[PDB]
Design a protein around this ligand. Structure first.
Ligand SMILES: [Mn+2]
Ligand SMILES: [Mn+2]
Ligand SMILES: [Mn+2]
Ligand SMILES: [Mn+2]
Lengths: 297, 297, 297, 297
């Protein structure tokens, strides 16, 4: 049921049909059930073909993006906000046609370091806009999942609590939270506590280390995270995330400030990630079983 | 508002009026507002006096004992068992007369390293007995609080979960858990998870480090403990325990195996522990409020 | 003879003499005994008066800045680099005249998100230039401590090991490391490991929580940090750092992306930070001694 | 070369020949490279047949005991002490006959809950005694490895620091520390700190969880442990150890106080442990490597 996926960009930024094969094959060989893509051009990509290959391998697909400056759905500039809505519509169309059920990533504002404090108007404009978009998405068989990111990557929703308040403000029953452990460790008071507080409104989870390298080679208490996810009975998808300057686009390198590369071999990276996640989850499950064991003699 | 207690044996073993006075004074000068007594001589100690001396000082009181071998209410020997009930009934009365509302400690079995594995009949025997002792305690306006201890100190209730199931077996509505962080860290799958699991059934709490010295100088995750307590909204008394063999009776000193002394200055020990617990709970409270902060612009 | 400090901007961002006065009195009431100032204009401020008021209170002083994009000493454009050196030289004379021993902060490159990936020539330029400014600093009786910051605030020195290498390249013995727990938790593989790796090259430390709010209210493992400092016998100054949109000036709020404020009462915040760092170090002192205890009978 | 090994009590509580040989097979199936026979009676054991299957299975071997009360080498009573020498001589022999390199377990004093606080005489006696036995073991090409245990399992050596001092007192170069994370978590101030303090003198390591069941299902910071071991360049044997009421003795089981059914499926247990240790160590290695990466552009 629950899929454990990986971000395509671990493998390749290239949207060439040949590079897409290697991405999908690597994903499968590394041990994952799901691929997350962040860019696809129908013009260059045969979406219909791509959709069938993803099914043929037994993989699931998710689509996540990050709104560009000129596509900021929360902008007072009405033309900018409209391109934001247009991108989201295109992204939903793509996700539906591709076989996926989730649209994820930074959907509420532009992705990047803003040069101005947020305002209530921004918050409300974004909320009213996502209210409507989420309808489009439902009609398409797709959920919206707002990614909560750190202060340097958006000025709006930084916290699960912020996310929850926003979602209420939307009024939608088709908007959920996309939580990322790399972002949570910067912004949340406890990562485990955030997850618990967000129970039932979590639609998608990124697993990324404090520095975005190998899982377990950083500062994040992953046992604490796997315990919380187990406590709440999270049974939806989760995806590994790590990036290299050598692989990702330089729009993204300059934006997520990847100045140094923490690994050179992505198959080793992904393979480790998959054993780390797999075993972390198993342990957490066994531990939850043990807590409640009566141990009557 | 609930009391932050200390155990007397931190101060001395002696029950002599002159020591009783020092014990209470030191307790206050350390910042604590509850005193825990384990031994109180039936013949040598004025109860109604002590009961007055306690309230005068703005101190709460609790009584904890560890059932001796020859008094194990779980023993098949109806005489040895009977000795246990009298020990209990006498401890209930001393508690009531002292102005305290909880009896605690190892109440369900002998305090010590048992020689045989636990049995189903041993279990039922203790529950059947404690069931009836509980109604006595009720009539006295006192509560029973079963300490859950490590494998070496009882063979019967080592875990919060088995402690929870035992209480279901008694059918009593006046029995609760006494959890101790030193024991919990040995037996529980996850101290915080065990606390969450027992919520609403915890009547008393013992704060003690992994090695039984200064708080924060061992291996226990006290932040996680405070977070859990905060999460389940615990509002009942708790006390610090930490033992020196130069201070405590050679009986308990052999029963809990104090071979080393981790401290010489118990005022510095107690002042440190008070600051540790106070700041700890404050910090966990601010953290739980922060988790839920809508940070709406 | 180490000081426990606090950054002025916890109190006020203003240079008015009445506000500078308040900053100082607040520092003392909170229990700190150093003050860190970000920058003060000599024509705007009665410097000698300030220095005399600092010494009268019994406070020490450090100055930290972050080079402007306008003044980046790593820049190829010489004019920009020269503006850097001149800002550096002025900051030194400020520290010296105020009766301080440390110039800290981002001293190696522009403070902010960079649009270019780092280069070796950028590295060498900064090294070459700082090698010289260190001599100026020595003559003035002051050390240069290079702040190591997260990817979003500089593109050059993000890691304690990067700093070590960088320092190595400067050939200087008046350039040390300025480590910041908030930055370390994002970039380092292990905060404690990184501290241990940097032994005898650490000139200054910022204590700040993962979200930059109240200490212990985030994800940073501070016990591990106090243990590492203690393992290396760190005997120099460290300061508490937390900021509020309400108090800082729009330049800093925007560069460090303070979108939401985690506290409102900065006296409570400071007193708390004082107890937390105070206790934290005492506890780490207690424990590192326990480790070694022979405990022979 | 070093091996990741396993304690026989995962598999069997028996010294019957077929059981011993099952043990070997189960060890190899679980991915382990060493077997440790604990509390083995060599009477009625075909050493040659056993040593043959070890070779076929590609296994290392170690022998671990805990001295009985009437074999306590630290006793004043000379008859009791001479018997403990004879037990040790016998177990040295069996180790050599089986192709082992290590004698291990509670070799310094009686394995159990002493009713006596330790004395300098006991210390000195045991030390002088073991200094001789060490020479015996050297001649047989075998190292001695003192297991440091918790307060309820010996009264002499509970702490790595004590053990370290003890080995100073024996004058030997053939006695080493055998540390156990289960005991360390109860006794040590900090497990990593203890491991770093004992560096160079660590001969053998047990990996066991707080409650002695599944690795990671209890309270122990295993990351910290694998980190410390990595930092000191530990390059000797370590072994998984776990107890459940399913497999029990009437000797070791009684001493270790095992009352609870933490597992029934010892092959799942072992394969999880094997993956845990395996992955934990790779993760530790990658992390330490990362700490000192220069990341110069
Ligand atoms: Mn993400
Ligand atoms: Mn207790
Ligand atoms: Mn800083
Ligand atoms: Mn062991």
């Amino acid at each position: 049921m629950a899929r454990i996926g990986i971000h395509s960009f671990v493998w390749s930024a290239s949207s060439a049909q040949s590079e897409l094969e290697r991405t999908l094959a690597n994903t499968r060989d590394a041990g994952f059930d799901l691929i997350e893509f962040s860019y696809l051009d129908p013009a260059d990509v045969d979406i219909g073909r791509l959709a069938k290959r993803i099914a043929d391998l037994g993989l699931g697909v998710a689509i996540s993006i990050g709104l560009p400056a000129d596509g900021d759905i929360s902008s007072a500039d009405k033309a900018v906000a409209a391109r934001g809505v247009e991108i989201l519509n295109q992204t939903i169309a793509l996700t539906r046609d591709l076989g996926g059920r989730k649209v994820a990533g930074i959907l509420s504002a532009g992705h990047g370091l803003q040069v101005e404090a947020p305002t209530r108007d921004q918050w409300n404009r974004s909320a009213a806009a996502l209210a409507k978009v989420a309808e489009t998405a439902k009609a398409a068989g797709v959920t919206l999942n707002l990614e909560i990111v750190n202060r340097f990557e958006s000025n709006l929703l930084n916290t699960a609590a912020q996310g929850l308040a926003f979602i209420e403000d939307t009024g939608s029953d088709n908007i959920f939270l996309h939580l990322d452990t790399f972002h949570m460790n910067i912004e949340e008071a406890d990562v485990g506590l955030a997850i618990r507080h967000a129970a039932g409104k979590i639609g998608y989870v990124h697993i990324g280390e404090s520095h975005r390298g190998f899982l377990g080679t950083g500062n994040i208490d992953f046992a604490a995270i796997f315990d919380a996810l187990t406590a709440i009975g999270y049974a939806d998808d989760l995806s590994f995330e790590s990036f290299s300057s050598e692989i990702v686009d330089e729009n993204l390198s300059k934006k997520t400030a990847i100045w140094r590369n923490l690994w050179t071999d992505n198959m080793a990276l992904a393979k480790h990630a998959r054993a780390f996640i797999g075993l972390g989850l198993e342990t957490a499950r066994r531990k939850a079983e043990l807590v409640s064991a009566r141990h009557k003699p």
